[PDB]
Design a protein that fits this description.
Keywords: mitochondria, ATP synthase, F1Fo dimer, IF1 dimer, membrane protein
Number of strands of chain A: 0
Largest interface: A-B, 15 and 13 residues
PDB class: membrane protein
Chains A, B: Inhibitor of F1 (IF1)
Organism of A, B: Tetrahymena thermophila
Helix content of chain A: over 70%
Distance between the termini of chain A: 64 Å
Order of helices and strands of chain A: HHH
Structural class of chain A: mainly alpha
Radius of gyration of chain A: 23 Å
Entry title: Cryo-EM structure of Tetrahymena thermophila mitochondrial ATP synthase - F1Fo composite dimer model
Oligomer: part of a larger assembly
Largest sheet of chain A: none
Chain lengths: 64, 41
C-alpha cells in the first residue's frame, strides 16, 4: 500500500518521455544552427569513403 | 669530379594492406604505394 510512490514514478516516467523527445529536437535545431590532414586528401583522390577510425590508425601507423 | 660523376649515376606494404582489410575497403597498389611513400615522407 504505497500510492505516493505510484505518483512519484508516474511523474518521473512521463516527464522523462516528454523531455527525451524534446532533447532530440533541441539537438537537431542547435546542430542545424551551428552548421550555418594529409591522409584526408590522398584518400579523397581515390574517391574512397573513409571513416574517422581508419584515419586514426593510419596516422598512428606513421607515427608508431 | 670522377667520384662525383659516379655517384650521380615490402613490409610496410603488408601493414597498410591489413588495415584496409579490417575496414573491408577497396585497395589498389597505387594507393598503397602512395601511403607507403607518405609514411617515408
Amino acid at each position: 500500500t504505497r500510492e505516493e510512490e505510484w505518483l512519484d514514478k508516474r511523474t518521473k516516467s512521463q516527464e522523462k518521455v516528454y523531455f527525451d523527445q524534446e532533447d532530440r529536437k533541441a539537438m537537431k535545431r542547435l546542430l542545424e544552427k551551428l552548421n550555418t590532414l594529409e591522409v584526408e586528401n590522398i584518400l579523397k583522390r581515390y574517391h574512397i569513403n573513409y571513416t574517422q577510425a581508419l584515419i586514426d590508425e593510419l596516422v598512428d601507423w606513421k607515427t608508431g | 669530379k670522377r667520384l662525383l660523376e659516379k655517384l650521380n649515376t615490402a613490409p610496410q606494404n603488408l601493414e597498410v594492406e591489413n588495415i584496409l582489410k579490417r575496414y573491408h575497403i577497396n585497395y589498389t597498389q597505387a594507393l598503397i604505394d602512395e601511403l607507403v611513400d607518405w609514411k617515408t615522407g
